[PDB]
């Protein structure tokens with residue numbers, strides 16, 4: 375009965391010349407996200423929500439860019455290590471919900487693939503992982519296609 | 534004890550010649566929100582939070598903005614159908630919290646009416662529904678009054 | 693006791709010259725500070741709104757329109773009092789600060805300690821996270837700082 379909630383936010387710039395990787399899925403698009411590794415905005419937000427629910431700080435405190443252990447680590451490896459640390463701190467994950475905000479491309483065809491990657495990385499049943507997607511109605515840098523945002527919420531319980 | 538959390542986000546442009554309908558309340562104003570449905574940004578954010586908590590996808594999955602049957606749709610009717618599907622998936626709603634962010638008009642006079650509408654639609658008492666209203670402190674497209682944003686959080690439990 | 697409730701909070705304040713930068717009750721050296729009627733502590737405000745939201749007590753604007761000169765930790769303490777008054781116990785708080793500058797990492801642990809003391813919580817039930825905005829929008833240009841918060845309470 376010792377439930378805890380966590381919330382996560384991430385954003386990355388979207389420009390020509392890089393791949394678009396969201397939720398572990400490479401998506402064909404004229405632009406891609408800029409960041410240290412694969413720049414997976416959705417997995418970063420979920421990771422931060424999980425560290426937050428466990429009150430373990432955040433993704434920057436756990437996985438520094440200079441650390442040799444995570445030099446070439448992609449964001450799924452980081453999500454899996456996050457989950458291991460959350461479990462070791464005594465918490466079981468109960469569910470994850472999230473939103474991707476991107477003016478383009480359409481993300482609906484890729485939701486089930488993202489959910490399957492996230493559930494596998496968290497060792498969760500598929501029906502405890504949700505990903506939602508929407509545009510920003512052409513408003514702001516998101517609406518002009520200059521960035522993509524992800525939001526995440528996670529519920530855990532201390533066991 | 535099988536609790537789940539969900540989160541929701543929505544935004545719509547503020548334009549001339551549209552009803553301003555937020556939380557089911559038709560608010561007197563020279564502009565209104567632009568969308569395929571009645572464009573109720575607050576009810577959409579809450580709908581997304583509820584679908585997300587039940588791991589049922591999102592409002593685009595259940596009520597496509599491409600579908601003619603939803604042109605001008607009453608978003609309270611959509612919220613009620615969302616709650617019906619969430620119940621059909623086995624979940625009871627425990628509470629909803631939300632934020633509306635707008636430069637104008639003043640929303641304080643309308644918040645209690647919005648809360649009562651949401652509570653009615655979700656078959657909740659008033660004390661389990663909360664609506665918060667704020668400005669964006671003059672920043673960004675929200676500060677310039679180009680759109681209105683809503684955020685939502687929901688807790689459900691699988692019975 | 694299984695009557696859990698969640699709340700969510702959002703705040704943003706402009707960064708302006710000639711004012712202290714106070715976030716999570718920590719005074720951070722910086723050329724600018726946050727603009728507000730209070731000390732404009734955007735993180736404490738977001739947490740405050742999340743707590744009012746979880747207890748279904750409305751929001752800051754309704755509670756804190758005898759507080760004319762109060763700093764935001766006093767308001768967070770008052771918020772926690774009202775949450776308790778309504779029969780709720782706070783179970784945990786999580787939050788994110790979005791600021792392009794300055795670096796907040798050295799100050800996070802003090803913010804967490806401040807929030808924990810104000811809410812009468814142990815450290816392991818309070819969390820503060822910090823991000824830039826990748827140089828995007830008004831946050832990325834350093835025109836404001838945003839905070840987000842989530843809170844879990846239970847009605848006893």
Ligand SMILES: Nc1ccc(S(=O)(=O)Nc2ccccn2)cc1
Nearest residue numbers: 568569570572577596597598603
């Ligand atoms: N059934 C339905 C519901 C909402 C809309 S909307 O384009 O007015 N608003 C939307 C649409 C998708 C996500 C969020 N808001 C159109 C159709």
Ligand SMILES: Nc1ccc(S(=O)(=O)Nc2ccccn2)cc1
Nearest residue numbers: 728729730732737752753756757
């Ligand atoms: N009592 C009180 C507290 C804070 C403020 S603020 O306008 O500096 N910050 C706010 C105000 C409303 C919602 C969020 N932050 C004004 C009055």
Ligand SMILES: [Zn+2]
Nearest residue numbers: 384414415418
């Ligand atoms: Zn990232």
Ligand SMILES: [Zn+2]
Nearest residue numbers: 543573574577
């Ligand atoms: Zn909408």
Ligand SMILES: [Zn+2]
Nearest residue numbers: 703732734737
């Ligand atoms: Zn504030």
